Design a protein around this ligand. Structure first.
Ligand SMILES: OC[C@H]1O[C@H](OC[C@H]2O[C@H](OC[C@H]3O[C@H](O)[C@H](O)[C@@H](O)[C@@H]3O)[C@H](O)[C@@H](O)[C@@H]2O)[C@H](O)[C@@H](O)[C@@H]1O
Length: 812
């Protein structure tokens, strides 16, 4: 095996510096910004790759001018505003320090880059206290330190608590030393975080180029901001995607869709999306509504739409050979992935429809061809897709025959991990082309880094297939799977609520596990119940107790829509997931590295779902601050401690941070059932002299105008001083979208005692009964008054949403 060895010279080309080392080897450092360094180590010095990055869309992160290199007798030095770089000459070693000269990131000995006949590896010093997070949608504990992980998009049904690899490959990790690494290679990469030795960690590939990006941040938020500068801002879903969604393996019929739609509405269980699974289509993959299964598909979609339901349909990436018309068409056009042994279309087995052709979404002409096929259901009013089985399915590491696949852009060993990625990109591109100024809904199984530009995600076929009742630990692991997916830029994520696997032979016995799965599930952005085949898992199937609890779980998510939607926008702007590992908000608190049983939803809410069988309590770690029970709003706790709370079956432990302001809407059966509604702001005043706020984001929820910053925002501020609370409703920040109106705001200030008076500006407001404050809340927009509820300990202040600044002063 070959190392860089001694560096004899350097050359600068603008923001790029190339160091020449032993036997034609070279290494480039490229300053994308003061914080982000592109590093390319090359065994032969040529700096070419078979394919340019599929993930990186921007390398200019604002670096100005040339890289300045200072030569010393035994080292070279490069300074940026945030970094100090030391390059040892003999032998080549790269070391990166922060501006205070603390070491962040160092090559291990002489083995910083290792080449062995095309196998490429990077070895880095591993510090005793260095922890690691990320690598996308992967199982096990949040903290990756001590374990090894592989990138090979795999199809592992009913996967275990530690199964790896899974369906997606996002080679972006973060270190507790406050940098991220994105290893910009699509082959079967492997990451070993001290799993081989305590002295070093490594990342490697069997082929391709050693190209990786070092992304410094002063915290994890900055690292993620740097990552989306490189790989793109997340697209937002249509607003209605943040409701509740329902699926089943057999959701492939008009009669059943009509039956289920009616049942949801009759039982007043809110729901926005009815999915259809893969059997909806006449064959793989013609996008024709199966004739026996749908009498009037247009009518169905419209009738469901009139009831507030949107429909999302499945697609697989293959054409069945039995689908003779489409297969022959595809094969004759050269649109199928080839077999290098024959030069002909690769002959792929598939679990349904017989052997198939794998559609080559890396071939440019395939895009418009697929686009025209997939548009058919969209012309009937379907709102998007779930793209399943793009690993491709049935192509795990041991299925070595797949390596014979030859795609337009390369061989399968290179293209496997971007097969689904390039498919998903086509789906979204073609959607944009044929459906003007509309947000796509796409939710995918297989993916690569950068997916956030095109698609959302779900965690595939989870749960226990031998006995559905034994899936508790698998359900529990969906917490860190989802948080890790979030850190890998899947902010719009869900899992199969109930799991995918296991026949439900006894609905009474399954009720507890279902209820807990849904309680967790409603705090995932794309909350979707689904199950294999004919195993019905709608929220009323588990008896009345479970139904009532599940209705309430779902109702809580709907009430929180304006809160959640504000964080959906924040995902677009900053890359931060809605579901946040506590470490993202409390990076200095090392206890957060251990937390696999709880998470933040945005910044204000801490959710700690019960995921243990028979449990009626929950252990919860509270980070810095003070924390209030969001269910009752009365019980308060000090931060930086472990507590145990009562958590019976009907209860989700949720806490609100003291100081928070939470926008909410009334219960509705689907998003926008009421196109205009009063917005309540639940305000939990912070400590004396501490100003807090929430910026309530709104936009049209459907178009791409938000990508051009067409929206409005309303900032609500709270600040307590001596026997006084000031609540400010900020002047509406108008950027080309006017909110639904006219409407009222209700400021709901949580307080121990009824105050003396409440003022709006200089003017004293009228105290009235709760009933009077509530009267004509959706019809009269001229009343400004306040009320007290002693039972709830809440001051309500009614005020029209005029769009103007208003200062509400509460005299304690
Ligand atoms: O011809 C056999 C069969 O074909 C269709 O059903 C296929 C299949 O559909 C569901 O499973 C699809 C499944 O794909 C991946 O695993 C995803 O990850 C899952 O989310 C997704 O549900 C169903 O669950 C299976 O039971 C079913 O075999 C027709 O619909 C069938 O009528 C027909 O028998």
């Amino acid at each position: 095996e070959q190392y860089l060895g001694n560096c004899t010279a350097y050359s600068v080309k603008g923001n790029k510096v190339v160091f020449s080392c032993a036997n034609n080897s070279k290494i480039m450092l490229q300053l994308c910004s003061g914080e982000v360094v592109k590093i390319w180590a090359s065994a032969d010095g040529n700096f070419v790759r078979n394919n340019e990055s599929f993930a990186v869309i921007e390398e200019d992160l604002g670096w100005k001018g040339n890289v300045t290199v200072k030569e010393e007798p035994s080292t070279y030095e490069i300074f940026t505003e945030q970094l100090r770089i030391r390059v040892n000459k003999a032998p080549f070693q790269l070391q990166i320090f922060d501006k205070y000269q603390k070491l962040l990131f160092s090559d291990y000995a002489e083995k910083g880059f290792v080449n062995d006949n095309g196998k490429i590896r990077t070895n880095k010093v591993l510090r005793n206290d260095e922890q690691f997070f990320g690598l996308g949608e992967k199982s096990g504990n949040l903290n990756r330190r001590g374990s090894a992980y592989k990138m090979w998009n795999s199809d592992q049904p009913c996967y275990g608590v530690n199964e790896d690899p899974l369906y997606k490959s996002i080679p972006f990790f973060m270190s507790s030393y406050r940098y991220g690494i994105f290893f910009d290679n699509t082959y079967k990469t492997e990451f070993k975080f001290g799993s081989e030795s305590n002295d070093y960690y490594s990342f490697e590939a069997p082929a391709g180029q050693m190209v990786y990006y070092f992304m410094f941040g002063n915290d994890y938020k900055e690292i993620i901001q740097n990552y989306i500068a490189l790989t793109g801002k997340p697209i937002m879903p249509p607003k209605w995607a943040l409701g509740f969604s329902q699926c089943r393996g057999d959701y492939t019929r008009e009669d059943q869709a009509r039956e289920i739609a009616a049942e949801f509405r009759k039982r007043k269980i809110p729901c926005d999306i009815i999915y259809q699974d893969i059997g909806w289509t006449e064959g793989l993959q013609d996008f024709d509504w199966r004739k026996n299964n749908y009498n009037n598909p247009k009518g169905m979609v419209k009738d469901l739409s009139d009831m507030g339901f949107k429909m999302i349909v499945s697609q697989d990436p293959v054409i069945s050979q039995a689908n003779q018309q489409q297969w022959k068409e595809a094969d004759a056009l050269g649109h199928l992935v080839k077999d290098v042994r024959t030069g002909k279309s690769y002959d792929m087995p598939w679990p349904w429809g017989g052997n198939c052709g794998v559609v080559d979404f890396t071939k440019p002409e395939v895009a418009d061809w697929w686009g025209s096929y997939q548009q058919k259901p969209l012309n009937d009013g379907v709102r998007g897709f779930w793209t399943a089985m793009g690993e491709p399915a049935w192509s795990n590491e041991d299925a070595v025959d797949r390596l014979n696949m030859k795609h337009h852009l390369g061989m399968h060993n290179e293209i496997h991990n971007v097969y689904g990625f390039t498919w998903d990109k086509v789906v979204t591109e073609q959607f944009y082309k044929h459906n003007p100024n509309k947000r796509i809904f796409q939710m995918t199984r297989a993916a690569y880094a950068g997916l956030q530009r095109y698609t959302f995600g779900w965690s595939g076929d989870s749960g226990n297939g031998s006995n559905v009742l034994d899936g508790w630990k698998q359900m529990a692991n969906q917490i860190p799977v989802g948080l890790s997916a979030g850190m890998g830029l899947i902010p719009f994520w869900t899992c199969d609520i109930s799991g995918y696997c296991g026949d439900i032979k006894d609905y009474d016995a399954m009720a507890e596990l279902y209820v807990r799965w849904l309680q967790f599930g409603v705090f995932t952005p794309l909350s979707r119940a689904h199950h294999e085949g004919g195993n019905a898992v709608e929220p009323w199937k588990f008896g009345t107790e479970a139904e009532n609890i599940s209705r309430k779980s779902i109702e809580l998510k709907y009430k929180l829509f304006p809160y959640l939607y504000t964080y959906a926008r924040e995902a677009h702007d900053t890359g931060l997931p809605i579901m946040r590992a506590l470490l993202l908000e409390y990076p200095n608190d090392k206890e957060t590295f251990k937390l696999n049983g709880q998470f933040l939803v945005g910044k204000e809410l801490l959710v700690a779902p019960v995921v243990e069988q028979g449990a009626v309590t929950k252990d919860v770690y509270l980070p810095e601050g003070e924390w209030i029970d969001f269910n009752n709003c009365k019980t308060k706790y000090k931060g930086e401690q472990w507590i145990t709370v009562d958590a019976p079956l009907n209860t989700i432990p949720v806490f609100v941070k003291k100081g928070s302001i939470i926008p909410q809407m009334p219960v509705m059966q689907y998003i926008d059932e009421k196109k205009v509604y009063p917005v309540t702001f639940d305000i939990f005043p912070g400590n004396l002299n501490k100003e807090t706020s929430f910026t309530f984001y709104e936009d049209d929820g459907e178009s791409r105008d938000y990508e051009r910053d067409v929206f409005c925002k309303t900032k609500i501020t709270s600040k307590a001083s001596n026997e006084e609370i000031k609540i400010t409703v900020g002047e509406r920040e108008y950027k080309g979208y006017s909110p639904a109106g006219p409407r009222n705001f209700i400021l709901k200030i949580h307080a121990s005692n009824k105050p003396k008076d409440v003022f709006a500006g200089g003017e004293k407001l009228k105290n009235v009964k709760p009933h009077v404050l509530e009267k004509n809340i959706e019809a009269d927009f001229t009343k400004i008054n306040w009320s007290w509820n002693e039972a709830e300990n809440v001051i309500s202040v009614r005020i029209p949403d005029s769009g103007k600044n208003a200062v509400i002063t509460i005299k304690n």
